[PDB]
Every structure is written in structure tokens, then in C-alpha cells.
């Protein structure tokens, strides 16, 4: 069953991410908080992206929309065109 779908981002994936950060030991309460944190970031990005998408009066979301929306948060991204 689906659990509002944020739960597809399982615990061990988050654990792997923390491992890449150089972390050795993780409390069990981090995971839930992280999910919420992640959601916020994504929400903001997508809003901006969709807004760009809406201006072109298109219905298909393009990578460039995401790239610009990331650029505006000061997290510029290279490697996906433009």
C-alpha cells in the first residue's frame, strides 16, 4: 500500500546519503524530519518550475524550467543543458 508516497524514500536510502556525508551514527528520529525537509525543498523548486512552464502555455515540463528554478535558489546546476 502507499503511505502518501513520501515513504517511497526509504530509510536505507537516507542512510546511504548520510554515509556520503561522512556520518558514522544516525538516530532513528532523523528520518521523519528529513522527509519533511526534503518535501519543502522540492515543493519550492517545482512551484517555480511549473510557473515557468505555465508562462510558455505548455503542458510538458522541461529540464530547463528546473534548471532556472534551481538557479534562483542559489543552487545553480550544471550538466543538463544551458
Amino acid at each position: 500500500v502507499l503511505r502518501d508516497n513520501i515513504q517511497g524514500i526509504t530509510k536505507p536510502a537516507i542512510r546511504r546519503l548520510a554515509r556520503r556525508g561522512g556520518v558514522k551514527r544516525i538516530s532513528g528520529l532523523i528520518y521523519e524530519e528529513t522527509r519533511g525537509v526534503l518535501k519543502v525543498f522540492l515543493e519550492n523548486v517545482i512551484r517555480d518550475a511549473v510557473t515557468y512552464t505555465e508562462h510558455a502555455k505548455r503542458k510538458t515540463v522541461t529540464a530547463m524550467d528546473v534548471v532556472y528554478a534551481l538557479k534562483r535558489q542559489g543552487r545553480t546546476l550544471y550538466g543538463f543543458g544551458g
Binding site: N5, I6, G8, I9, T10, A13, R16, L17, A18, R19, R20, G21, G22, V23, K24, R25, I26, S27, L29, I30, E33, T34, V37, L38, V40, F41, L42, E43, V45, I46, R47, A49, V50, T53, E54, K59, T60, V61, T62, A63, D65, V66, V67, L70, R75, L77, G79, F80, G81
Partner: protein, 101 residues
């Protein structure tokens, strides 16, 4: 053998650190991420379609942001003479960098 071989805590974690630090493949699963993105965008506008590359771009951005945060968080934890990260560490880091939300 009389007992199963069993590493002590930390060793295998460190092994995983060096492994993932040597490689570059994305760690988040593709399909669940796709479904999450589709649900949220549906909440903003209906019946949208997504290029594959945009989804990949979001994937990269999310993972980079998370690792950056966890790095600063780990520093915060070590500052308090601990080795176990906790929520208030994250909250502190997020409050200082100005991502208050």
C-alpha cells in the same frame, strides 16, 4: 567455525563510506521519486507530463542539497562532543544558513 564472523560497529559503516565516496551513482530509486514528483505537481496543476531529464535534474539537486546539509550537521554534532546526529543539529544548521522555511 564456532560462531559467525561479525564485524564490530563502525567498520562496515566506514567501508560503505569509502565505497560510496569512490562512486557517483545516484542513490535514490527512480520510480518512487517519479511518483512523488507527479503527485505534488498534480496538486499544483493537473495532468502534467514530465521529461525524463527534468526528473533526473531534480534527483541530482536533491541529493546534493542533502549531502551538503548532513555535512554541516555532522560538524554541528561534533561541536557538542557527540558522534550521534540529532534533529536539533539539523535545525541549528538550517537556521544559520538562512533556509529557515
Amino acid at each position: 567455525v564456532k560462531k559467525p564472523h561479525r564485524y564490530r560497529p563502525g567498520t562496515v559503516a566506514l567501508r560503505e563510506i569509502r565505497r560510496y565516496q569512490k562512486s557517483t551513482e545516484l542513490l535514490i530509486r527512480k520510480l518512487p521519486f517519479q511518483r512523488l514528483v507527479r503527485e505534488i505537481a498534480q496538486d499544483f496543476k493537473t495532468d502534467l507530463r514530465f521529461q525524463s531529464s527534468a526528473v533526473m535534474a531534480l534527483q541530482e539537486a536533491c541529493e546534493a542539497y542533502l549531502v551538503g546539509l548532513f555535512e554541516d550537521t555532522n560538524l554541528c554534532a561534533i561541536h557538542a562532543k557527540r558522534v550521534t546526529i540529532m534533529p536539533k543539529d539539523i535545525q541549528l544548521a538550517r537556521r544559520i544558513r538562512g533556509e529557515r522555511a
